[PDB]
Protein backbone atom coordinates (compact mmCIF):
# COMPACT_ATOMS: atom_id res chain seq x y z
CA UNK A 1 0.00 0.00 0.00
CA UNK A 2 2.12 2.81 -1.42
CA UNK A 3 2.61 6.22 0.21
CA UNK A 4 0.79 9.15 -1.33
CA UNK A 5 3.04 11.58 -3.20
CA UNK A 6 1.69 15.11 -2.78
CA UNK A 7 2.77 18.33 -4.48
CA UNK A 8 3.51 20.82 -1.67
CA UNK A 9 3.77 24.54 -2.43
CA UNK A 10 6.66 26.05 -0.47
CA UNK A 11 9.35 28.67 -0.57
CA UNK A 12 12.92 27.49 -1.09
CA UNK A 13 15.26 29.15 1.39
CA UNK A 14 19.01 29.05 0.93
CA UNK A 15 22.19 31.08 1.32
CA UNK A 16 22.05 33.73 4.07
CA UNK A 17 18.36 33.00 4.57
CA UNK A 18 17.32 34.39 1.19
CA UNK A 19 14.62 32.85 -1.03
CA UNK A 20 14.56 31.36 -4.54
CA UNK A 21 12.88 34.08 -6.57
CA UNK A 22 11.83 34.48 -10.23
CA UNK A 23 13.34 37.89 -10.93
CA UNK A 24 10.87 40.81 -10.94
CA UNK A 25 7.94 38.38 -10.93
CA UNK A 26 8.27 38.04 -14.71
CA UNK A 27 7.75 34.68 -16.34
CA UNK A 28 8.90 34.93 -19.96
CA UNK A 29 11.12 31.99 -20.91
CA UNK A 30 14.74 32.43 -19.89
CA UNK A 31 14.18 34.98 -17.14
CA UNK A 32 16.73 34.38 -14.39
CA UNK A 33 16.05 32.82 -11.00
CA UNK A 34 17.76 34.71 -8.16
CA UNK A 35 18.21 35.07 -4.42
CA UNK A 36 15.87 37.64 -2.93
CA UNK A 37 14.66 38.44 0.61
CA UNK A 38 11.82 36.07 1.49
CA UNK A 39 8.41 37.67 1.10
CA UNK A 40 5.49 37.14 3.45
CA UNK A 41 2.79 37.64 0.78
CA UNK A 42 1.25 35.26 -1.77
CA UNK A 43 3.35 36.37 -4.77
CA UNK A 44 3.82 33.42 -7.12
CA UNK A 45 7.47 34.17 -7.93
CA UNK A 46 8.65 32.76 -4.54
CA UNK A 47 6.14 29.90 -4.15
CA UNK A 48 7.32 26.62 -5.68
CA UNK A 49 5.19 23.54 -6.35
CA UNK A 50 7.18 20.34 -5.88
CA UNK A 51 5.53 18.34 -8.65
CA UNK A 52 5.32 14.54 -8.73
CA UNK A 53 7.37 14.45 -11.96
CA UNK A 54 10.38 15.98 -10.13
CA UNK A 55 9.82 19.44 -11.56
CA UNK A 56 9.86 22.56 -9.38
CA UNK A 57 7.28 25.04 -10.66
CA UNK A 58 6.30 28.66 -10.09
CA UNK A 59 3.21 30.10 -11.77
CA UNK A 60 3.06 26.89 -13.80
CA UNK A 61 6.56 27.21 -15.32
CA UNK A 62 9.66 25.19 -14.47
CA UNK A 63 12.86 25.87 -12.61
CA UNK A 64 15.29 25.02 -15.42
CA UNK A 65 19.04 24.80 -15.74
CA UNK A 66 20.45 26.61 -18.75
CA UNK A 67 22.86 23.75 -19.37
CA UNK A 68 24.76 20.77 -18.05
CA UNK A 69 28.17 22.25 -17.31
CA UNK A 70 29.32 24.01 -14.11
CA UNK A 71 28.60 27.71 -13.70
CA UNK A 72 25.64 28.25 -16.10
CA UNK A 73 22.55 30.08 -14.91
CA UNK A 74 19.14 28.81 -13.78
CA UNK A 75 15.98 30.22 -15.30
CA UNK A 76 12.21 29.98 -15.50
CA UNK A 77 11.02 28.12 -18.60
CA UNK A 78 7.90 26.58 -20.13
CA UNK A 79 7.89 23.00 -18.80
CA UNK A 80 6.93 21.41 -22.12
CA UNK A 81 9.19 23.36 -24.49
CA UNK A 82 12.20 23.25 -22.17
CA UNK A 83 14.51 20.27 -22.52
CA UNK A 84 12.93 17.77 -20.15
CA UNK A 85 16.20 16.76 -18.44
CA UNK A 86 16.88 20.41 -17.63
CA UNK A 87 13.66 20.70 -15.59
CA UNK A 88 14.32 17.67 -13.36
CA UNK A 89 15.56 18.00 -9.79
CA UNK A 90 15.93 15.87 -6.68
CA UNK A 91 15.77 17.39 -3.22
CA UNK A 92 18.10 15.56 -0.86
CA UNK A 93 17.68 15.17 2.91
CA UNK A 94 21.08 16.82 3.34
CA UNK A 95 19.79 20.01 1.70
CA UNK A 96 21.19 19.58 -1.81
CA UNK A 97 19.05 20.28 -4.87
CA UNK A 98 20.61 18.34 -7.76
CA UNK A 99 19.90 18.06 -11.49
CA UNK A 100 20.20 14.31 -12.26
CA UNK A 101 21.18 14.68 -15.92
CA UNK A 102 24.22 16.84 -15.13
CA UNK A 103 24.80 15.83 -11.47
CA UNK A 104 25.25 19.58 -10.84
CA UNK A 105 23.55 21.29 -7.92
CA UNK A 106 21.60 24.49 -7.47
CA UNK A 107 23.85 27.21 -6.12
CA UNK A 108 24.08 30.88 -5.17
CA UNK A 109 27.73 31.83 -5.69
CA UNK A 110 27.19 35.22 -4.09
CA UNK A 111 25.23 35.99 -0.93
CA UNK A 112 23.65 39.31 -2.00
CA UNK A 113 20.06 39.98 -2.96
CA UNK A 114 19.70 39.71 -6.72
CA UNK A 115 22.39 37.03 -7.13
CA UNK A 116 21.56 34.94 -10.19
CA UNK A 117 21.34 31.24 -9.34
CA UNK A 118 23.62 28.77 -11.14
CA UNK A 119 24.34 25.04 -11.27
CA UNK A 120 27.71 24.02 -9.83
CA UNK A 121 29.86 21.01 -9.03
CA UNK A 122 28.64 19.58 -5.72
CA UNK A 123 31.00 20.39 -2.84
CA UNK A 124 28.30 20.54 -0.14
CA UNK A 125 29.02 24.20 0.44
CA UNK A 126 26.72 26.64 2.21
CA UNK A 127 26.25 28.22 -1.24
CA UNK A 128 24.61 24.91 -2.22
CA UNK A 129 22.37 24.32 0.82
CA UNK A 130 18.60 24.73 0.54
CA UNK A 131 15.45 23.98 2.47
CA UNK A 132 11.90 23.71 1.07
CA UNK A 133 9.74 25.39 3.72
CA UNK A 134 7.49 28.37 4.39
CA UNK A 135 9.62 29.22 7.44
CA UNK A 136 11.52 32.37 6.57
CA UNK A 137 13.38 32.49 9.86
CA UNK A 138 16.24 30.30 11.05
CA UNK A 139 15.66 27.78 13.81
CA UNK A 140 17.05 29.30 17.03
CA UNK A 141 18.22 26.76 19.59
CA UNK A 142 20.83 25.91 22.15
CA UNK A 143 23.15 23.01 21.29
CA UNK A 144 23.89 20.69 24.20
CA UNK A 145 26.66 18.10 24.20
CA UNK A 146 29.14 16.32 26.47
CA UNK A 147 28.36 16.45 30.22
CA UNK A 148 25.26 18.46 29.35
CA UNK A 149 27.38 21.48 28.41
CA UNK A 150 26.22 24.15 25.95
CA UNK A 151 28.00 25.17 22.74
CA UNK A 152 29.07 28.77 23.29
CA UNK A 153 30.52 31.51 21.06
CA UNK A 154 33.06 34.05 22.31
CA UNK A 155 34.04 36.34 19.44
CA UNK A 156 35.94 34.03 17.09
CA UNK A 157 36.15 31.05 19.45
CA UNK A 158 33.71 28.25 20.19
CA UNK A 159 33.69 25.75 23.07
CA UNK A 160 31.24 24.09 25.48
CA UNK A 161 30.34 25.71 28.78
CA UNK A 162 27.85 25.28 31.62
CA UNK A 163 24.40 26.05 30.22
CA UNK A 164 22.67 29.27 31.21
CA UNK A 165 19.40 30.32 29.60
CA UNK A 166 20.41 33.96 30.16
CA UNK A 167 23.35 33.67 27.71
CA UNK A 168 22.75 34.94 24.19
CA UNK A 169 26.21 33.54 23.32
CA UNK A 170 24.76 30.03 23.80
CA UNK A 171 21.95 30.60 21.26
CA UNK A 172 22.43 29.40 17.69
CA UNK A 173 20.57 30.16 14.47
CA UNK A 174 20.24 27.08 12.22
CA UNK A 175 19.99 28.61 8.74
CA UNK A 176 18.34 26.94 5.71
CA UNK A 177 21.71 26.83 3.89
CA UNK A 178 23.15 24.44 6.53
CA UNK A 179 25.13 27.13 8.34
CA UNK A 180 25.14 27.39 12.14
CA UNK A 181 25.31 31.02 13.14
CA UNK A 182 25.82 32.64 16.56
CA UNK A 183 22.57 34.34 17.42
CA UNK A 184 24.36 37.59 18.25
CA UNK A 185 26.16 37.88 14.89
CA UNK A 186 24.22 36.34 12.00
CA UNK A 187 26.99 37.34 9.56
CA UNK A 188 29.28 34.81 11.31
CA UNK A 189 29.33 31.02 10.89
CA UNK A 190 30.59 27.89 12.65
CA UNK A 191 33.62 27.25 10.44
CA UNK A 192 36.24 24.55 10.00
CA UNK A 193 39.40 25.91 8.35
CA UNK A 194 39.84 22.60 6.47
CA UNK A 195 38.26 19.23 5.68
CA UNK A 196 40.82 17.41 7.84
CA UNK A 197 40.65 15.73 11.24
CA UNK A 198 41.61 17.68 14.38
CA UNK A 199 41.01 21.08 12.81
CA UNK A 200 39.73 23.35 15.61
CA UNK A 201 36.36 24.80 14.66
CA UNK A 202 35.94 28.58 14.93
CA UNK A 203 33.44 31.40 14.39
CA UNK A 204 34.29 33.25 11.17
CA UNK A 205 32.57 35.41 8.56
CA UNK A 206 29.92 33.56 6.50
CA UNK A 207 31.25 35.37 3.38
CA UNK A 208 32.82 32.31 1.71
CA UNK A 209 29.71 30.14 2.30
CA UNK A 210 32.17 27.28 2.07
CA UNK A 211 32.20 23.49 2.50
CA UNK A 212 33.67 24.08 5.98
CA UNK A 213 30.62 26.09 7.06
CA UNK A 214 27.84 23.60 6.22
CA UNK A 215 26.59 21.19 8.89
CA UNK A 216 23.91 18.52 9.16
CA UNK A 217 22.19 17.30 12.33
CA UNK A 218 22.11 13.50 11.89
CA UNK A 219 19.65 11.02 13.34
CA UNK A 220 22.36 9.50 15.56
CA UNK A 221 23.01 12.74 17.45
CA UNK A 222 26.15 13.78 15.55
CA UNK A 223 26.69 17.07 13.74
CA UNK A 224 28.26 16.23 10.41
CA UNK A 225 30.37 18.34 8.08
CA UNK A 226 28.96 16.91 4.83
CA UNK A 227 31.92 17.55 2.55
CA UNK A 228 34.58 16.04 4.79
CA UNK A 229 32.53 13.25 6.39
CA UNK A 230 33.89 14.38 9.79
CA UNK A 231 31.73 15.22 12.81
CA UNK A 232 31.85 17.87 15.54
CA UNK A 233 33.90 16.48 18.42
CA UNK A 234 34.78 17.79 21.90
CA UNK A 235 38.54 17.41 21.74
CA UNK A 236 39.86 14.51 23.89
CA UNK A 237 36.43 14.54 25.63
CA UNK A 238 37.94 17.39 27.64
CA UNK A 239 35.84 20.57 27.88
CA UNK A 240 38.69 22.39 29.62
CA UNK A 241 40.68 22.47 26.39
CA UNK A 242 38.00 24.83 24.98
CA UNK A 243 38.39 23.22 21.54
CA UNK A 244 35.79 21.57 19.32
CA UNK A 245 37.29 19.73 16.36
CA UNK A 246 36.47 17.77 13.24
CA UNK A 247 37.05 14.07 13.87
CA UNK A 248 36.10 10.73 12.25
CA UNK A 249 32.77 9.34 13.42
CA UNK A 250 32.81 7.09 16.45
CA UNK A 251 29.64 8.19 18.26
CA UNK A 252 31.10 8.35 21.79
CA UNK A 253 29.56 10.99 24.11
CA UNK A 254 31.98 13.74 23.01
CA UNK A 255 30.44 13.51 19.50
CA UNK A 256 26.77 13.53 20.60
CA UNK A 257 24.72 16.74 20.58
CA UNK A 258 21.12 17.78 20.91
CA UNK A 259 19.26 20.94 19.81
CA UNK A 260 17.30 22.10 22.84
CA UNK A 261 14.88 24.90 22.08
CA UNK B 1 9.98 -18.96 24.15
CA UNK B 2 9.75 -15.42 25.50
CA UNK B 3 9.77 -12.03 23.82
CA UNK B 4 13.02 -10.01 24.03
CA UNK B 5 13.54 -8.44 27.46
CA UNK B 6 15.40 -5.17 28.12
CA UNK B 7 16.39 -4.17 31.67
CA UNK B 8 16.63 -0.89 33.53
CA UNK B 9 17.08 -0.15 37.21
CA UNK B 10 16.68 3.21 38.88
CA UNK B 11 19.03 2.07 41.67
CA UNK B 12 22.30 3.81 40.88
CA UNK B 13 21.06 4.96 37.48
CA UNK B 14 23.42 7.15 35.47
CA UNK B 15 23.20 9.13 32.27
CA UNK B 16 25.07 6.22 30.66
CA UNK B 17 22.87 3.43 32.01
CA UNK B 18 19.69 5.21 30.91
CA UNK B 19 21.18 5.95 27.47
CA UNK B 20 22.18 2.28 27.05
CA UNK B 21 18.70 1.23 28.13
CA UNK B 22 16.90 3.43 25.61
CA UNK B 23 19.24 2.46 22.77
CA UNK B 24 18.65 -1.23 23.54
CA UNK B 25 14.89 -0.65 23.50
CA UNK B 26 15.11 0.98 20.05
CA UNK B 27 17.29 -1.88 18.79
CA UNK B 28 14.57 -4.41 19.66
CA UNK B 29 11.63 -2.31 18.46
CA UNK B 30 12.88 -2.33 14.88
CA UNK B 31 15.68 -3.74 12.74
CA UNK B 32 16.42 -0.44 11.05
CA UNK B 33 15.99 -1.96 7.60
CA UNK B 34 13.19 0.54 6.85
CA UNK B 35 14.61 4.07 7.16
CA UNK B 36 12.87 7.06 5.56
CA UNK B 37 14.48 10.51 5.41
CA UNK B 38 17.11 9.07 7.80
CA UNK B 39 14.45 8.21 10.45
CA UNK B 40 13.82 4.50 11.24
CA UNK B 41 10.29 3.15 10.73
CA UNK B 42 8.75 0.63 13.10
CA UNK B 43 7.48 -2.71 11.68
CA UNK B 44 4.18 -2.69 9.81
CA UNK B 45 1.43 -4.17 11.97
CA UNK B 46 -0.24 -5.82 8.97
CA UNK B 47 1.05 -9.37 8.69
CA UNK B 48 3.49 -8.98 11.57
CA UNK B 49 3.73 -12.46 13.18
CA UNK B 50 2.57 -12.66 16.78
CA UNK B 51 5.97 -13.96 17.95
CA UNK B 52 7.47 -10.63 16.80
CA UNK B 53 4.74 -8.30 18.06
CA UNK B 54 5.99 -7.29 21.54
CA UNK B 55 9.10 -6.61 23.60
CA UNK B 56 9.40 -6.60 27.40
CA UNK B 57 10.95 -3.99 29.66
CA UNK B 58 11.83 -5.21 33.15
CA UNK B 59 12.12 -2.24 35.54
CA UNK B 60 13.70 -2.55 38.99
CA UNK B 61 14.20 0.04 41.71
CA UNK B 62 16.03 0.78 44.93
CA UNK B 63 13.21 -0.86 46.89
CA UNK B 64 14.16 -4.14 45.13
CA UNK B 65 10.78 -4.36 43.38
CA UNK B 66 10.38 -5.26 39.70
CA UNK B 67 7.64 -4.96 37.11
CA UNK B 68 7.77 -5.87 33.44
CA UNK B 69 6.14 -3.58 30.88
CA UNK B 70 5.02 -4.94 27.53
CA UNK B 71 5.59 -2.69 24.51
CA UNK B 72 3.95 -3.06 21.09
CA UNK B 73 6.74 -2.95 18.48
CA UNK B 74 4.42 -1.31 15.92
CA UNK B 75 4.11 1.89 17.97
CA UNK B 76 6.65 1.54 20.85
CA UNK B 77 3.78 1.99 23.32
CA UNK B 78 3.01 0.24 26.61
CA UNK B 79 0.11 -2.22 26.32
CA UNK B 80 0.23 -3.70 29.82
CA UNK B 81 2.53 -5.03 32.48
CA UNK B 82 3.25 -7.90 34.83
CA UNK B 83 3.85 -7.68 38.56
CA UNK B 84 4.55 -11.00 40.26
CA UNK B 85 1.69 -13.39 39.51
CA UNK B 86 -0.65 -10.79 37.95
CA UNK B 87 -0.82 -9.11 34.55
CA UNK B 88 -2.68 -5.88 33.70
CA UNK B 89 -3.59 -4.66 30.21
CA UNK B 90 -4.94 -1.47 28.72
CA UNK B 91 -8.33 -1.84 27.03
CA UNK B 92 -7.56 -3.07 23.47
CA UNK B 93 -8.62 -0.96 20.51
CA UNK B 94 -9.92 -3.87 18.45
CA UNK B 95 -10.56 -7.61 18.40
CA UNK B 96 -7.19 -8.46 16.82
CA UNK B 97 -5.27 -6.55 19.49
CA UNK B 98 -7.38 -8.29 22.16
CA UNK B 99 -6.25 -11.66 20.78
CA UNK B 100 -2.66 -10.41 20.47
CA UNK B 101 -2.25 -9.54 24.14
CA UNK B 102 -3.21 -13.07 25.20
CA UNK B 103 0.29 -14.03 24.00
CA UNK B 104 1.91 -11.91 26.74
CA UNK B 105 2.79 -13.28 30.18
CA UNK B 106 1.11 -16.57 29.34
CA UNK B 107 2.08 -18.32 32.59
CA UNK B 108 0.85 -15.51 34.86
CA UNK B 109 -1.84 -16.65 37.31
CA UNK B 110 -4.28 -13.70 37.02
CA UNK B 111 -5.06 -11.30 34.17
CA UNK B 112 -7.00 -8.02 34.18
CA UNK B 113 -8.01 -5.77 31.28
CA UNK B 114 -8.79 -2.19 32.37
CA UNK B 115 -11.77 -0.15 31.24
CA UNK B 116 -9.40 2.53 29.88
CA UNK B 117 -6.87 2.57 27.08
CA UNK B 118 -3.42 4.05 27.53
CA UNK B 119 -4.08 7.38 25.82
CA UNK B 120 -2.99 10.40 27.86
CA UNK B 121 -6.40 12.10 27.94
CA UNK B 122 -7.99 9.35 30.02
CA UNK B 123 -4.91 8.63 32.14
CA UNK B 124 -4.71 12.32 33.05
CA UNK B 125 -8.40 12.20 33.95
CA UNK B 126 -7.76 9.20 36.17
CA UNK B 127 -4.59 10.61 37.71
CA UNK B 128 -6.24 13.95 38.46
CA UNK B 129 -3.37 15.80 36.79
CA UNK B 130 -2.24 16.81 33.33
CA UNK B 131 1.17 15.79 32.03
CA UNK B 132 2.42 19.33 32.62
CA UNK B 133 1.92 18.82 36.38
CA UNK B 134 3.45 15.33 36.76
CA UNK B 135 7.16 15.28 37.44
CA UNK B 136 9.45 12.98 35.47
CA UNK B 137 12.91 11.78 36.36
CA UNK B 138 14.62 8.90 38.14
CA UNK B 139 12.82 9.60 41.42
CA UNK B 140 9.37 9.61 39.77
CA UNK B 141 10.25 6.43 37.90
CA UNK B 142 11.45 4.73 41.11
CA UNK B 143 8.09 5.61 42.68
CA UNK B 144 6.11 4.55 39.61
CA UNK B 145 7.73 1.11 39.71
CA UNK B 146 6.74 0.63 43.35
CA UNK B 147 3.21 1.85 42.60
CA UNK B 148 2.84 -0.51 39.64
CA UNK B 149 4.12 -3.37 41.77
CA UNK B 150 1.82 -2.76 44.73
CA UNK B 151 -1.28 -2.45 42.55
CA UNK B 152 -1.28 -6.26 42.40
CA UNK B 153 -1.40 -6.57 46.20
CA UNK B 154 -4.10 -3.96 46.75
CA UNK B 155 -1.68 -1.23 47.89
CA UNK B 156 -2.11 1.27 45.01
CA UNK B 157 -5.25 3.14 44.10
CA UNK B 158 -6.27 4.06 40.55
CA UNK B 159 -5.13 7.74 40.42
CA UNK B 160 -1.62 6.75 41.52
CA UNK B 161 -1.65 3.88 39.02
CA UNK B 162 -2.65 6.28 36.24
CA UNK B 163 0.08 8.75 37.21
CA UNK B 164 2.61 5.90 37.25
CA UNK B 165 1.62 4.84 33.72
CA UNK B 166 2.04 8.45 32.57
CA UNK B 167 5.55 8.49 34.06
CA UNK B 168 6.63 5.15 32.55
CA UNK B 169 5.14 5.78 29.11
CA UNK B 170 6.97 9.07 28.71
CA UNK B 171 10.27 7.91 30.18
CA UNK B 172 10.32 4.70 28.11
CA UNK B 173 7.99 4.85 25.09
CA UNK B 174 8.30 8.56 24.28
CA UNK B 175 12.05 8.54 24.98
CA UNK B 176 12.46 5.64 22.54
CA UNK B 177 10.39 7.56 20.01
CA UNK B 178 12.29 10.87 20.34
CA UNK B 179 16.00 11.60 20.89
CA UNK B 180 14.70 14.93 22.18
CA UNK B 181 12.70 13.31 24.97
CA UNK B 182 15.47 10.83 25.76
CA UNK B 183 17.71 13.89 26.14
CA UNK B 184 15.20 15.48 28.52
CA UNK B 185 15.26 12.43 30.80
CA UNK B 186 19.04 12.31 30.53
CA UNK B 187 19.12 15.89 31.85
CA UNK B 188 16.94 15.04 34.85
CA UNK B 189 19.30 12.20 35.77
CA UNK B 190 22.39 14.32 35.08
CA UNK B 191 21.39 16.99 37.60
CA UNK B 192 19.41 14.69 39.98
CA UNK B 193 16.28 16.75 39.33
CA UNK B 194 12.64 15.84 38.85
CA UNK B 195 10.36 18.11 36.85
CA UNK B 196 7.30 17.99 34.66
CA UNK B 197 7.80 18.01 30.87
CA UNK B 198 7.79 21.48 29.29
CA UNK B 199 5.43 22.27 26.36
CA UNK B 200 8.00 21.26 23.74
CA UNK B 201 7.98 17.72 25.16
CA UNK B 202 4.19 17.46 25.50
CA UNK B 203 3.55 18.74 21.98
CA UNK B 204 6.09 16.33 20.50
CA UNK B 205 4.29 13.47 22.25
CA UNK B 206 0.95 14.73 20.94
CA UNK B 207 2.32 15.05 17.39
CA UNK B 208 4.17 11.73 16.98
CA UNK B 209 1.47 10.10 14.87
CA UNK B 210 1.01 13.15 12.64
CA UNK B 211 4.78 13.61 12.25
CA UNK B 212 5.14 9.99 11.13
CA UNK B 213 2.42 10.51 8.53
CA UNK B 214 3.83 13.85 7.34
CA UNK B 215 7.37 12.49 6.86
CA UNK B 216 6.32 9.30 5.10
CA UNK B 217 3.85 11.12 2.85
CA UNK B 218 6.23 13.98 2.11
CA UNK B 219 7.51 14.82 -1.35
CA UNK B 220 11.22 14.39 -0.71
CA UNK B 221 10.94 15.64 2.87
CA UNK B 222 8.66 18.64 2.22
CA UNK B 223 5.32 18.29 4.00
CA UNK B 224 1.95 18.72 2.33
CA UNK B 225 0.84 20.76 5.36
CA UNK B 226 2.71 22.03 8.44
CA UNK B 227 2.99 20.43 11.87
CA UNK B 228 2.79 22.93 14.72
CA UNK B 229 5.22 22.41 17.62
CA UNK B 230 6.14 24.39 20.71
CA UNK B 231 9.34 25.77 22.20
CA UNK B 232 10.23 25.13 25.84
CA UNK B 233 8.60 28.46 26.74
CA UNK B 234 5.28 27.51 25.13
CA UNK B 235 5.60 29.67 21.99
CA UNK B 236 4.40 28.02 18.79
CA UNK B 237 6.15 27.43 15.48
CA UNK B 238 5.42 25.37 12.39
CA UNK B 239 7.51 22.68 10.69
CA UNK B 240 7.17 22.23 6.92
CA UNK B 241 10.01 19.80 6.19
CA UNK B 242 11.77 16.81 7.72
CA UNK B 243 15.20 18.46 8.05
CA UNK B 244 14.87 19.84 11.58
CA UNK B 245 13.17 16.63 12.75
CA UNK B 246 15.99 14.25 11.84
CA UNK B 247 17.76 14.73 15.24
CA UNK B 248 14.42 15.04 17.09
CA UNK B 249 12.52 11.85 16.07
CA UNK B 250 14.07 8.39 16.45
CA UNK B 251 11.17 6.10 15.40
CA UNK B 252 8.00 6.45 13.30
CA UNK B 253 4.86 4.33 13.16
CA UNK B 254 4.54 2.57 9.81
CA UNK B 255 2.05 4.51 7.67
CA UNK B 256 2.53 3.18 4.12
CA UNK B 257 4.92 1.36 1.82
CA UNK B 258 7.80 2.98 -0.11
Amino acid at each position, epitope marked *: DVCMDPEPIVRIVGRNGLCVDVRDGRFHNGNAIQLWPCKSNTDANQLWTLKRDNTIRSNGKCLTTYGYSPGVYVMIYDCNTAATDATRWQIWDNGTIINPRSSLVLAATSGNSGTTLTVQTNIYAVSQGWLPTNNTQPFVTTIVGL*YGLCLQANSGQVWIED*CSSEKAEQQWALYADGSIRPQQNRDNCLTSDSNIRETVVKILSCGPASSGQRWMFKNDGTILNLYSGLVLDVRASDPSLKQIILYPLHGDPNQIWLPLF | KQYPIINFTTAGA*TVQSYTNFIRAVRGRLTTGADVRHEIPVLPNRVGLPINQRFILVELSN*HAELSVTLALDVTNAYVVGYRAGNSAYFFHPDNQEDAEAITHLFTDVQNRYTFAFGGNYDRLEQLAGNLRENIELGNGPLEEAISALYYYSTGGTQLPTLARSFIICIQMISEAARFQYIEGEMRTRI*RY*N*RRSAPDPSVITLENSWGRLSTAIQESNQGAFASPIQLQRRNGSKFSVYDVSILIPIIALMVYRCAP
Partner: nanobody, 124 residues
Framework: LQLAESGGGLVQAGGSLNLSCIAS????????MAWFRQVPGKEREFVAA???????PYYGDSVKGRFTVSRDNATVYLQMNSLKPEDTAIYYC????????????????????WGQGTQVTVSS
Protein backbone atom coordinates in the same frame (compact mmCIF):
# COMPACT_ATOMS: atom_id res chain seq x y z
CA LEU C 1 30.52 3.22 55.10
CA GLN C 2 34.31 3.64 54.99
CA LEU C 3 36.54 5.22 52.35
CA ALA C 4 40.17 4.14 52.00
CA GLU C 5 42.88 6.03 50.14
CA SER C 6 45.95 4.35 48.70
CA GLY C 7 48.88 5.16 46.48
CA GLY C 8 50.57 8.00 48.33
CA GLY C 9 54.31 8.00 48.85
CA LEU C 10 57.54 9.75 47.91
CA VAL C 11 58.54 11.11 44.52
CA GLN C 12 60.80 13.87 43.30
CA ALA C 13 59.78 17.02 41.46
CA GLY C 14 58.36 16.27 38.03
CA GLY C 15 57.34 12.75 39.05
CA SER C 16 53.89 11.19 39.05
CA LEU C 17 51.62 9.20 41.36
CA ASN C 18 48.20 7.62 41.06
CA LEU C 19 45.95 7.62 44.12
CA SER C 20 42.92 5.39 44.51
CA CYS C 21 39.87 5.63 46.75
CA ILE C 22 37.87 2.47 47.47
CA ALA C 23 34.65 2.39 49.44
CA SER C 24 33.90 -0.57 51.71
CA UNK C 25 30.44 -0.71 50.15
CA UNK C 26 28.71 0.58 47.03
CA UNK C 27 25.85 2.95 47.82
CA UNK C 28 23.78 4.10 44.88
CA UNK C 29 22.83 7.51 46.31
CA UNK C 30 26.21 9.20 45.86
CA UNK C 31 26.24 12.49 43.90
CA UNK C 32 29.93 13.44 43.88
CA MET C 33 33.27 11.90 44.79
CA ALA C 34 36.11 14.29 45.52
CA TRP C 35 39.80 14.57 46.36
CA PHE C 36 41.03 17.15 48.88
CA ARG C 37 44.47 17.87 50.30
CA GLN C 38 45.69 19.43 53.53
CA VAL C 39 49.05 20.63 54.81
CA PRO C 40 49.63 21.57 58.48
CA GLY C 41 48.15 24.93 59.45
CA LYS C 42 46.08 25.36 56.28
CA GLU C 43 42.47 24.49 55.57
CA ARG C 44 41.66 21.52 53.38
CA GLU C 45 41.93 22.43 49.70
CA PHE C 46 39.65 21.12 46.94
CA VAL C 47 41.68 19.12 44.43
CA ALA C 48 39.23 17.32 42.13
CA ALA C 49 35.68 16.00 41.95
CA UNK C 50 33.71 13.56 39.83
CA UNK C 51 29.96 13.87 39.23
CA UNK C 52 28.38 10.44 39.75
CA UNK C 53 25.51 10.89 37.26
CA UNK C 54 27.71 11.32 34.18
CA UNK C 55 31.39 11.28 35.14
CA UNK C 56 32.06 14.99 34.59
CA PRO C 57 35.42 15.94 36.17
CA TYR C 58 36.24 19.14 38.08
CA TYR C 59 39.63 20.42 39.27
CA GLY C 60 40.96 22.88 41.81
CA ASP C 61 42.85 25.98 40.75
CA SER C 62 46.35 24.77 41.60
CA VAL C 63 46.07 21.55 39.56
CA LYS C 64 46.64 23.19 36.23
CA GLY C 65 45.75 20.41 33.83
CA ARG C 66 48.27 18.20 35.65
CA PHE C 67 45.87 15.73 37.32
CA THR C 68 43.08 13.48 36.08
CA VAL C 69 40.26 12.18 38.28
CA SER C 70 38.44 9.13 36.98
CA ARG C 71 36.20 6.19 37.80
CA ASP C 72 36.35 2.53 36.84
CA ASN C 73 33.95 -0.36 36.59
CA ALA C 74 33.42 -1.24 40.25
CA THR C 75 36.93 2.83 42.61
CA VAL C 76 37.90 6.48 42.00
CA TYR C 77 41.44 7.42 40.96
CA LEU C 78 43.53 10.60 40.91
CA GLN C 79 46.35 10.56 38.36
CA MET C 80 48.91 13.18 39.45
CA ASN C 81 51.62 14.23 36.97
CA SER C 82 54.37 16.88 36.93
CA LEU C 83 54.40 17.02 40.72
CA LYS C 84 55.87 20.11 42.41
CA PRO C 85 57.05 20.34 46.04
CA GLU C 86 54.00 22.54 46.64
CA ASP C 87 51.88 19.39 46.13
CA THR C 88 53.20 17.75 49.32
CA ALA C 89 50.17 17.19 51.55
CA ILE C 90 47.84 14.60 53.00
CA TYR C 91 45.30 13.72 50.30
CA TYR C 92 41.76 12.68 51.24
CA CYS C 93 38.89 11.22 49.26
CA UNK C 94 35.38 12.32 50.18
CA UNK C 95 31.79 11.55 49.29
CA UNK C 96 28.72 13.77 48.82
CA UNK C 97 25.07 12.61 48.71
CA UNK C 98 21.76 14.10 47.63
CA UNK C 99 23.16 16.99 45.58
CA UNK C 100 20.59 18.44 43.18
CA UNK C 101 21.24 21.07 40.52
CA UNK C 102 23.64 22.14 37.77
CA UNK C 103 26.67 23.01 39.94
CA UNK C 104 29.02 20.97 42.11
CA UNK C 105 30.14 20.80 45.75
CA UNK C 106 33.74 21.96 46.11
CA UNK C 107 34.18 22.85 49.80
CA UNK C 108 35.21 20.53 52.62
CA UNK C 109 32.00 21.23 54.56
CA UNK C 110 29.87 19.97 51.63
CA UNK C 111 31.26 16.41 51.87
CA UNK C 112 30.24 14.33 54.85
CA UNK C 113 32.14 11.04 54.37
CA TRP C 114 35.96 11.06 54.49
CA GLY C 115 38.84 8.63 54.28
CA GLN C 116 41.74 8.90 56.70
CA GLY C 117 44.05 10.35 54.04
CA THR C 118 47.25 9.22 52.38
CA GLN C 119 50.51 11.16 52.56
CA VAL C 120 52.06 12.57 49.37
CA THR C 121 55.62 13.88 49.60
CA VAL C 122 57.36 15.50 46.62
CA SER C 123 61.14 15.76 46.80
CA SER C 124 63.42 18.65 45.77
Amino acid sequence: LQLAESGGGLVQAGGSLNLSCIASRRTLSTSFMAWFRQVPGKEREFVAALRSSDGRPYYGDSVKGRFTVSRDNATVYLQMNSLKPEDTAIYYCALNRGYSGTGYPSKQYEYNDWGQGTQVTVSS
